[PDB]
Amino acid sequence: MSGSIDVITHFGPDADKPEIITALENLTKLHALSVEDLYIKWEQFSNQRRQTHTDLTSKNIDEFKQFLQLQMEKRANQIILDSLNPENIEISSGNPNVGLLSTEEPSYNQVKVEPFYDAKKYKFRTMRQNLQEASDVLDDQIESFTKIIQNHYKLSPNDFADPTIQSQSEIYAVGRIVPDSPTYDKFLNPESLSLETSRMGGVGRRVRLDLSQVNELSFFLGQIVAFKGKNANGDYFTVNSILPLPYPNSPVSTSQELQEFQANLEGSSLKVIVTCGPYFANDNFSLELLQEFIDSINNEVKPHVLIMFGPFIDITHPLIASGKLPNFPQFKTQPKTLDELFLKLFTPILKTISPHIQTVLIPSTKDAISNHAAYPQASLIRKALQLPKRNFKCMANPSSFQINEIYFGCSNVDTFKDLKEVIKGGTTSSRYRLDRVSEHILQQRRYYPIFPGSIRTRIYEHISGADLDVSYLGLTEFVGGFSPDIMIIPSELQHFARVVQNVVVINPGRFIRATGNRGSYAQITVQCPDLEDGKLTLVEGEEPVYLHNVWKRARVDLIAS
Amino acid sequence: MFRQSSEEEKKLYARLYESKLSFYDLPPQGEITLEQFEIWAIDRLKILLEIESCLSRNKSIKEIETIIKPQFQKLLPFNTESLEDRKKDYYSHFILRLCFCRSKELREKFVRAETFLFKIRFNMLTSTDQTKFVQSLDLQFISNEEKAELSHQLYQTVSASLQFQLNLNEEHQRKQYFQQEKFIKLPFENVIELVGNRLVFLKDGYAYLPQFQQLNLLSNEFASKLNQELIKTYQYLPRLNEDDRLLPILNHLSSGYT
Amino acid sequence: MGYYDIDDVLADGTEFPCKFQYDIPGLGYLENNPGRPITKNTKLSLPLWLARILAIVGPVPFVELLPPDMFSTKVMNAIKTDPVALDLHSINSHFFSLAIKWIMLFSEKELANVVSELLLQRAQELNHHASSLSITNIATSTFLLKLEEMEKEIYKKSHESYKDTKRWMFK
Amino acid sequence: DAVFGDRVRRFQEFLDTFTSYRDSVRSIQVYNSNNAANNILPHRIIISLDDLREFDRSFWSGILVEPAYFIPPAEKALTDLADSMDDVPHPNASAVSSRHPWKLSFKGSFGAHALSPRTLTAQHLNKLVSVEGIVTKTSLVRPKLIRSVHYAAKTGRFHYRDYTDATTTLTTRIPTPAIYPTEDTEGNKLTTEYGYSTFIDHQRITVQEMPEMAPAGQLPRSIDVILDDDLVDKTKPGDRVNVVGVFKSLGAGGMNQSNSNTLIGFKTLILGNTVYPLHAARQMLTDFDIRNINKLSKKKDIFDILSQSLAPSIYGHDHIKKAILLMLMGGVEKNLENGSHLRGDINILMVGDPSTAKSQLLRFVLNTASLAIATTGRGSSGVGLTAAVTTRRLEAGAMVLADRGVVCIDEFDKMTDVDRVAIHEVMEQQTVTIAKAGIHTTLNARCSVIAAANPVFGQYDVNRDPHQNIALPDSLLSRFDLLFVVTDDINEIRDRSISEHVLRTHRYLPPGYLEGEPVPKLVTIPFLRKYVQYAKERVIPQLTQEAINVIVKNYTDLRNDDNTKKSPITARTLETLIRLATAHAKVRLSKTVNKVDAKVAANLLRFALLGED
Amino acid sequence: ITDVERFKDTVTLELSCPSCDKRFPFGGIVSSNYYRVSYNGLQCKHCEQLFTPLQLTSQIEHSIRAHISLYYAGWLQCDDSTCGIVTRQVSVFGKRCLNDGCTGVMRYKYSDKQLYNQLLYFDSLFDCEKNKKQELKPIYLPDDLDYPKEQLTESSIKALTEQNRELMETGRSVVQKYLNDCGRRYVDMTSIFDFMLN
C-alpha cells in the first residue's frame, strides 16, 4: 500500500501500473531520497528539454535515473634521580630572558646552535640498498682503520699480512669481528668468533679466531679490530695480542673564540635540557605530562637549549599497531592521519615554548612523522610541523652540532641496548658495561658500530630494528674525525651520565614510562670557558688552542619528568 | 619627449619550444619517472606507427594530416604552452632514439616516421612561426640584379608551380607574386629531388629555388642530423646497459617494428 | 586620506550588502525595528564606515561582505571594451575612492590592473578637452557629463592652468 | 588572398581553446540525428564577444570594425569543426549538395556601437552595430534562389551553378542574371532538378525609434532590416526589439546616369545577424523555484496566505480576493470526442457604492496577470470590443486580442444596450463570428471577464429588489460565475480601522531614498506569479466521486429551496461549482479534486449568492 | 601488466577492527564477508563499527613501516639451490656466498622490487579509478570458502567510490608519502647524458 499510494499522491494515478511503481521504488531505495523528493527531482528533470510530454513511461524513468546520477556526481563535484659532578658545579640559573614578554630582539645572551654536518647528504632516497654499495662501505671501514692503526703504531705496510694464509711469523691483521658460522643462532662466545678481512688485506676471507692466549677481551659483532698473531696451521688465527684502537682527538677552540663565548653568556653557565620520547603512555595519547614539563621549562628551569629526541609518534605504539586509536573530543575536526595527529596534539604544545629557548628536534626511525625510515636519517621538516623558524631547529639522526664551544654528538638509535659484548676475563667483567660500550663507540668512531643491526621479533615475525641503510653508514661516523664533548644516545636502559675518556656520555632515559608513570630527562649545566681558572688545557702549536675539558666543568642531573 | 627607465630546466624547455618545433638539439636534465618513460615512449610510438602504416598504404599528406592531427591532443600535444606536454614530446623523442638506434633498419624506419611527423607539424605552423623556427636553426638569397638577369628563366620555371601549388591561375597574379618572391641559390646536388622533377632552374651547377618551396631541405637536415645522432646513440649503448630496468621497455618498444 | 576631508567623509557613507554570522539581541534597529534581535544569515545593506569594522572584529567575525553591484562582471567588461565612452558618473559618483578602499580591504591584484588602465585611458581625453581654448560648447559638454567627482577636480585645475598661461602670453 | 587562410586558422585556435562552443555544435548535431530516425534545430551558434576579446584583441577589433573581412573566414572555420565531427552515413541526394554552412551570432559589450535609429550616422557604415526600437512593418515571406542542379540527358552527368545578389553576401561580387541554363557546353540538352536545388527564405522589416525618445514633436526616424533562413517571422508589428547586424550601403546612387544631378543619396540597410526581444509576459523557473513552490504547497492554509498576499494595500474584502485568486488559476477546458466543447474560464462581476475600492481592486489584476487588456465600458463599442471590417480584411477587437488571458471592464453600467449584446457569445462559446458584406469567418476568444459597476440609484437600496437595483437582463447575469454586492456602511470601529490603515500606507518610503527626497507572512508578488504560472502549466486535477457527492447535493438544494437569492439559478450554476472546486484543487497542487475542495467552493458560492455565512 | 600479475607476491593488507579485534583482508571497495563500505566509510560486518579515517590510515602506515623495517632487516639468501643459506651477514664482496666452497650469489630475501610492488599494491587499494574499474587484485577467488555471496553492482561501486573519495584520497596520500622517498622510482637525465660530456 504505502509506497504505491505515496507515489500516487505525488505522481499521478497513471503510476498505478506495477512496473512504474517498482522502478520508482527502486530509485528511492537506491538513493535514499523520499518519494516526494523523487517527485521534486522528476520535476527538475521535466524542465529544460522542450518536452511538455514528459510522460511517466519506462524510458523517461530510465533517463530520469541517468539524470539523477548526473545530479549526484555533480553535487559530489561541487562538494634528581642521579647526578654527575654535583659536589663541584652548581646548577645553572638558566636563560634570564625566558619569561620576559618583550618583543625586543634577543640582543646579548644568544647561545648559538650550529649544525656540524652536511644536511644534504642525509637527504638520500631510502628503500633501495645495492648490495655492492653496502659491501663497498663495509670494506672501506676496514681499510680506513688499517690506515689509522698503521699511522698510530708506526707500522710498515709490509707488517700487515693475510691472517687466512698459513704463516709461522707473527703478523698484524685488521678485520671485522664476525661469527664463525654464517647461520649463527644469536649467542656468541669467544670460541665462535671469526675475523673478516678487507678485499685488499685478505681477499675478504674469514678466519676463525683462537683467543686462548688473550686473558682480557670485549668484542662485539661488526667491530673493527687489530690483532698481532699468527696462523700456524691454516685453520685458526691465534691472537697473541690485541692492538687497542686509538681514540679520536678532542675538539679544540682558540683563545679568541672562547672569550667570545664567555662574553655571550656574561660569565654565566650554559643550561641544556635533554628529553627522549615516547611522550605519552602505551594506553593513551595524553600529553598532560609534556604540557606540565613545558610550563616548568618556561617558568622555573628556563634553559638556554632544549633537545628533544623522538619518537614523537611511535609507529610501533600498541594503539597504532592494533588500530584502536581513540576519538579526540577536544578537537572540532578529528585528525585523519598520524601527521595531522601530531599537528593537533604536539604542535600547539611545542609552540608555547619560549622563543628565547632554542629547541632542537632529532627524529627516530620509529617516528611516524618522518618518511625517511632508515638510519642514518634525514631531519624532520619543520615547516610541515608548523613550528616557528626562530627557535626550532630540526637535525638529522645522528647529528653533530655545536652549542657555543661545546660539540654535541647525538644518535637516536639504542646502541647501548643493541650492543651485545662477548667478554672474557675477570677485570673486563668487573668493569661497568655501559663504560665499555661507550669506549667501543668512541674507538670505532661511529655512533652505531654494530653490524648486522639489531632486530626485534615476536612469536617469528619481524617487528622493528635499527633499520640500517648500509650504503650510507659513513654518515654515522664522528664528523671531523674527533669525539664529541658530550655524547647523547637515548636508550631503553636505565638513565645514566658518565665520563668516558673525557667525553660526557648521557642516556636521559624515556620521558614517560609505558604505564604512564613519570620517566626521566637530563639537565646539563656547563660552566663558561675561563682561560684563567685552569680547567682548560693549553695545547701548544703554531696557533695556541685549548681543550674544552667539558667533563671537568659540566654537571649532569637526571631528573624525574 | 617623456621616458621611463629546477628553474633552469623549465627555462630550457620554454626556450626549446618557443619555436613550437625543435630539432631536439640538447641533453635533457633532471628527472622523470620510469612509468612516464614507458608511457611517453609508447605514445610517440603509436603516432609513428600510424604514420608508417599510412605511408605503407600510400596515403597523401592531406590524408595523413587528417588521420594524425586528432591524435596529438590524446598522445603527443603540439602548439601548447604546457611544460608537461613539452617535456613529454622532447623526452619521448629521446627515448625512441635509444630504442631505434640499435640497427640500420630501425634507424631508417624511425628517421622516416619522425621526419614525416616533423613535416606534418611544420605544416601546422603559421608562416611567422616557420620563419622564426628556420631563423633559430641558423639556416644565400640571390641579388635583385641576378634575379632580373635570370627573370625569364626563373619565371618560366615557377609559373606552373605558382598556378598549381599556390592556385594562381591568373597570369597577372603570378607576375605580381613573382615580383615579390625571393630566390635561393645553392648547389644542384642539395635539392636533387626537385631537380629530377624539373621544379628548379639550373645554371653552372647551381639550383635556383623560390622561397615558397624548399621545406625538403629543412626536413632533410632534420633527417640527416637525426641519423647522425642515432649513429652516435648506437656507439654509447654500452652505457645504457648499466640500468637493467630500461632494457625490457626498449625491447618491447622495438618489437612492434620487427 | 585626511580626517577633515569632506569627500572622504561623504564617500564612507555609501552602503554595501552584508550578511550576519551570529544572532544578536536588540540590534534590530539596523533592520529598522529596535524591538527585535538580529538573526544569523540575515542580509542587510549597511554603510561602509560600519561594515568595514563589523567584517573584521571577531574566530569568525560578526558580518560577511557580499560582492557589490558596482564591481559586477558587466561593469568590468564595459570598462575593458571602451573606457572613454563609459558613463562612470551614473555607475557611482565616487568610483575611484571606493575602488581604492575595496582594494585595500581585500588586497585585489586584478582589479587594480583594470582600474589603473581605466584611469590612464580617460586622462587622455580629459587633457584634450582641457587644452582646447576658445579664441565648441556642445562637443565638450557631452563628455564632461560622464566624469566622476574625482575627475572634475583634475579637469578644473588643468583648465585654469592652461588658461592663465594663455592670458599672460597674449595680454 | 593568403590572409583568408590565416584568419581561418586563428579562429580554429579560438574554437579549440574555448570548449563550451564544441559542446553546442555536438549537442545540436546529436539531437537532430536522433529525431531524424523517427522540430529540427537550426545550424546556428551564439558566441560571447568578450571571450574573443580576451583570446585575441587583433581578431576582436577585426570582427567589430571590418566584419566583411573577418566574419566569413570565422564562419567557414565553424563549419569545418562541425563537419569533421562524426555524422550519419549515406546522405540522400538533397543532403549531398545542400549548400548549407553553419552561422554565427553575437552577445555582450558592444560599447560605442550600441545605437538607436535617430543616431545611426554615415560614419558607422560597414561597421557591426546594435540598434533598438519598435517594429512597424513586415514584408511577406518569399523564397530566393541560390543554387540550381541540372541532369545532362546523354552523358549522365549532374551539373550545377550558384547565384548571388547584393543582400546575400557581406563581400561584393558581379551580379548574376537569374537565368536557368538550357544547354550544355557540349551541346547536350539539360533538365532542371528541383528538390536538389536550394532555395532560402527572405523577409524585410522596418524599425523605428521608440516614441518615448522623440524630441519636440518632431518626425520620427527609422531603418529597414533584412532577415533570412532561421530569422524569418520571429517578430510582428508593435514588438519592441534589439537587432544586431552589419550596416551597409547599396546601388548606384544616381551616378549611373540620371536626371537628379546626383543630389539624391545612396540607399542603406542593416543585415540581420541576431535578434533579441525586449520585456517592456513570461518568466522561466530555476531549480530552486521548483523546490520552494513544492515545499510551500504543504502548509495547512496556503489559500489564505496567497489570497491575503494579493493587494495588501487594500483593507478588507477577503472573499473577493479569494475569488480573484481562483479566477487566475481557472478550471479545466474540455473537448469531447464528438467535437463538443465545455467551458473552463471563470467570470466575476462586482457592483457597489461609490469610493469602495472597486476600480482600485480591479486595477490590481492588470498588473499581476500574464496577459491582460483593460477598457472602460463607455469608451468601447460592440464591434471595437469584438471585431470590425476594414480594407476585405477583418480586424480583431479587445476580447479577441486577450485570447488566453483576462479582460478588465470598468464603468460597466455606462455601456449601451447595443454594445452589451455583442458579448453574449464570447462569454460562453468563446468565439466571435462575423457575417457582413464580402466576409464570413469565426475567431477564437477564450478569456475570463472581470468587471465593475454602479447600482441604478447611485447607492445600493436594500428596501428595493435586487433586479430594481441592478438593471441588467437575466440572460447576462447568468454568465457571471460570482456576483458580489459591496457597500459603504458607516460604523465607528470600521471607519477607524480603515483610516488608520490608509494613513500607515501613505507613510511608506522606498528603500534607496532619504526622507523627503522625490522618488502572518506574505509572499512577494514576483514569487506569486511564478507559483501561478507553475500551477497552471504542470497540474491538471481530475474529478473524484467524493467531490461529486458534495456538488450534486449542494446544487439541488440551492436551486429548489425558496430564498431571497440575488441571481438566477440555472444549469450554469452547477458548472460554476465544478470550476471553483477544480481551481481550488489546483491551488493545492493536487492531482485530484477532493471533498475539501468541493466544500470550500460551495462555501464561497453560498456567500456571494445568498449574502451570508 | 595487470595488478593481478604485478601484485601476485605482495602481502594482502589486513585491517584489525578497533572494537572487536577481528582481523580481515581489505581489498578496496569490493564485496566482503568481513567488512562493508557504506556512504559513511568502512564498516566492520561483525560488530558494525564504523572506522574513523585515522583508524584506517594509521593501520596502513603501520603496515608500510613494518614492510620497510623488514626490508632493512637485511636478510640475504644464496641463490644456489644446494646451499640456500639464509643470513644477515654481508661479506666485503657483497654477492659472495659466505658458505665455504659455495659459488652461489647472495641476494636480498626481501628485495627493493618486492617492497616497491608492496607499496604500489597498497597505493592501488585506495585508487578511486582502479576501484571503479574493478582492476584491483582480488582478495577472494570464486572457489574460496569466504567468497561473498552478494556482489556489489558496478553502479554501486562507482557510487560508493564517489561517496568515499575523501577517505580513499587520504589513504592514498599516506602511501604516496613513502613512495616518493623510494629510491626505485626516478631517472636522472643529467647524469645519463654523459656522451655529450665526451
Ligand SMILES: Nc1ncnc2c1ncn2[C@@H]1O[C@H](COP(=O)(O)OP(=O)(O)NP(=O)(O)O)[C@@H](O)[C@H]1O
Ligand atoms: N481599504 C480601502 N477601502 C476603500 N477605499 C480605499 C481603501 N484604501 C484606499 N482606498 C481609496 O479609495 C479611493 C477610491 O477607490 P476606487 O477604487 O476608485 O473606488 P471605486 O469603487 O472605483 N469608486 P467609484 O470610482 O466612484 O466607482 C482611492 O483613492 C483609494 O486609494
Ligand SMILES: [Mg+2]
Ligand atoms: Mg473609482
